[PDB]
Design a protein around this motif. Structure first.
Motif, mmCIF file in Angstrom:
data_model
loop_
_atom_site.group_PDB
_atom_site.id
_atom_site.type_symbol
_atom_site.label_atom_id
_atom_site.label_comp_id
_atom_site.label_asym_id
_atom_site.label_seq_id
_atom_site.Cartn_x
_atom_site.Cartn_y
_atom_site.Cartn_z
ATOM 1 N N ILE A 36 0.825 -1.204 0.000
ATOM 2 C CA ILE A 36 0.000 0.000 0.000
ATOM 3 C C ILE A 36 0.857 1.251 0.000
ATOM 4 O O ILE A 36 0.594 2.204 -0.739
ATOM 5 C CB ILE A 36 -0.957 0.004 1.217
ATOM 6 C CG1 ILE A 36 -2.010 -1.101 1.052
ATOM 7 C CG2 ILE A 36 -1.604 1.382 1.374
ATOM 8 C CD1 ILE A 36 -2.798 -1.389 2.318
ATOM 9 N N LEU A 37 1.910 1.241 0.803
ATOM 10 C CA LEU A 37 2.793 2.395 0.904
ATOM 11 C C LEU A 37 3.533 2.736 -0.393
ATOM 12 O O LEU A 37 3.927 3.891 -0.614
ATOM 13 C CB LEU A 37 3.788 2.196 2.054
ATOM 14 C CG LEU A 37 3.155 2.384 3.445
ATOM 15 C CD1 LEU A 37 4.153 2.003 4.520
ATOM 16 C CD2 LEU A 37 2.691 3.831 3.608
ATOM 17 N N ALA A 38 3.717 1.721 -1.227
ATOM 18 C CA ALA A 38 4.382 1.888 -2.519
ATOM 19 C C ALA A 38 3.504 2.683 -3.497
ATOM 20 O O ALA A 38 3.989 3.127 -4.543
ATOM 21 C CB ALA A 38 4.702 0.528 -3.109
ATOM 22 N N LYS A 39 2.216 2.841 -3.184
ATOM 23 C CA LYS A 39 1.322 3.596 -4.069
ATOM 24 C C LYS A 39 1.278 5.042 -3.625
ATOM 25 O O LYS A 39 1.345 5.351 -2.433
ATOM 26 C CB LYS A 39 -0.118 3.060 -4.032
ATOM 27 C CG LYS A 39 -0.272 1.593 -4.327
ATOM 28 C CD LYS A 39 0.252 1.259 -5.697
ATOM 29 C CE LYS A 39 -0.109 -0.152 -6.079
ATOM 30 N NZ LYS A 39 0.293 -0.455 -7.488
ATOM 31 N N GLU A 40 1.161 5.941 -4.593
ATOM 32 C CA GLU A 40 1.053 7.348 -4.266
ATOM 33 C C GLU A 40 -0.327 7.441 -3.597
ATOM 34 O O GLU A 40 -1.314 6.886 -4.124
ATOM 35 C CB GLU A 40 1.073 8.206 -5.536
ATOM 36 C CG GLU A 40 1.739 9.564 -5.334
ATOM 37 C CD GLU A 40 3.248 9.450 -5.189
ATOM 38 O OE1 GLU A 40 3.726 9.131 -4.080
ATOM 39 O OE2 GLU A 40 3.956 9.676 -6.193
ATOM 40 N N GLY A 41 -0.381 8.116 -2.444
ATOM 41 C CA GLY A 41 -1.627 8.240 -1.715
ATOM 42 C C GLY A 41 -1.762 7.111 -0.697
ATOM 43 O O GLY A 41 -2.658 7.146 0.148
ATOM 44 N N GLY A 42 -0.861 6.120 -0.753
ATOM 45 C CA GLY A 42 -0.913 5.002 0.181
ATOM 46 C C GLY A 42 -0.847 5.380 1.661
ATOM 47 O O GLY A 42 -1.641 4.874 2.477
ATOM 48 N N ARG A 43 0.082 6.249 2.050
ATOM 49 C CA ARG A 43 0.178 6.636 3.470
ATOM 50 C C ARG A 43 -1.072 7.408 3.934
ATOM 51 O O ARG A 43 -1.547 7.200 5.045
ATOM 52 C CB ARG A 43 1.457 7.438 3.742
ATOM 53 C CG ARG A 43 1.489 8.759 3.046
ATOM 54 C CD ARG A 43 2.843 9.427 3.169
ATOM 55 N NE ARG A 43 3.203 9.723 4.552
ATOM 56 C CZ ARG A 43 4.066 9.003 5.257
ATOM 57 N NH1 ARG A 43 4.647 7.949 4.704
ATOM 58 N NH2 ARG A 43 4.358 9.345 6.512
ATOM 59 N N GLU A 44 -1.637 8.254 3.075
ATOM 60 C CA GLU A 44 -2.838 8.981 3.459
ATOM 61 C C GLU A 44 -3.969 7.973 3.654
ATOM 62 O O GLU A 44 -4.724 8.053 4.625
ATOM 63 C CB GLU A 44 -3.242 9.989 2.389
ATOM 64 C CG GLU A 44 -2.323 11.186 2.298
ATOM 65 C CD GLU A 44 -0.958 10.900 1.642
ATOM 66 O OE1 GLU A 44 -0.825 9.935 0.850
ATOM 67 O OE2 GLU A 44 -0.010 11.668 1.930
ATOM 68 N N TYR A 45 -4.067 7.021 2.735
ATOM 69 C CA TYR A 45 -5.103 6.012 2.810
ATOM 70 C C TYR A 45 -5.088 5.280 4.140
ATOM 71 O O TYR A 45 -6.129 5.090 4.770
ATOM 72 C CB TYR A 45 -4.954 5.009 1.673
ATOM 73 C CG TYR A 45 -5.841 3.817 1.867
ATOM 74 C CD1 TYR A 45 -7.228 3.944 1.757
ATOM 75 C CD2 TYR A 45 -5.306 2.566 2.217
ATOM 76 C CE1 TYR A 45 -8.062 2.871 1.993
ATOM 77 C CE2 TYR A 45 -6.136 1.487 2.452
ATOM 78 C CZ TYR A 45 -7.522 1.651 2.341
ATOM 79 O OH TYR A 45 -8.379 0.617 2.596
#
Ligand code: HEM
Length: 131
Positions: A36-45
């Motif tokens: 998930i963290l590898a995706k842009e927006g992952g940390r916000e998600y």
């Protein structure tokens, strides 16, 4: 204060101390958080899940889940950042994220203005382009 491992006790009955979850019931966090963290927006998600909960059909490690997770917005910003840092490091996910940045209390604080429903959080997940 804020000990992410201690706060994680509130998540362990479902996601388990080893972060492997229970297929068909609670998704794994170990291994999966890095994805998930590898995706842009992952940390916000991930922060949105903690603040607002999640509901709806998702797939994780090729397995389907259609459950519900409550919000943990009652936790302090420092506590949410701590537990998210815990699930990001307890099983080695952080080392697997190029340029991993620890979650901070300020990041959590900022996202409290969102006021989303668990369905809106699922909509956010779908934009990550996971699986
Ligand atoms: C405890 C504070 C706690 C954390 C941390 C946590 C994290 C977490 C994440 C990051 C997700 C998203 C996974 C994804 O692929 O999008 C997630 C999802 C679910 N959770 Fe959770 N979770 C915490 C606590 C709990 C507890 C106490 C339960 C069980 C009663 C639980 C359950 C679930 C379920 C189910 C999901 C999937 C929801 C769906 O739409 O199928 N979580 N959790």
């Amino acid at each position: 204060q804020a000990d992410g491992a201690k706060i994680y006790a509130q998540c362990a009955g479902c996601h388990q101390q080893n972060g492997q979850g229970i297929p068909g019931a609670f998704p794994p966090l170990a291994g999966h958080v890095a994805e998930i963290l590898a995706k842009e927006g992952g940390r916000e998600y991930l922060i949105l899940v903690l603040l607002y909960g999640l509901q709806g059909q998702i797939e994780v490690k090729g397995m389907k889940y259609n459950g519900v997770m409550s919000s943990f917005a009652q936790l302090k910003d420092e506590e949410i950042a701590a537990v998210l840092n815990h699930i990001a490091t307890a099983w080695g996910d952080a080392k697997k994220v190029k340029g991993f940045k620890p979650f901070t209390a300020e990041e959590v604080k900022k996202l409290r203005a969102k006021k989303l429903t668990p369905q809106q959080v699922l909509a956010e997940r779908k934009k990550l382009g996971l699986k």
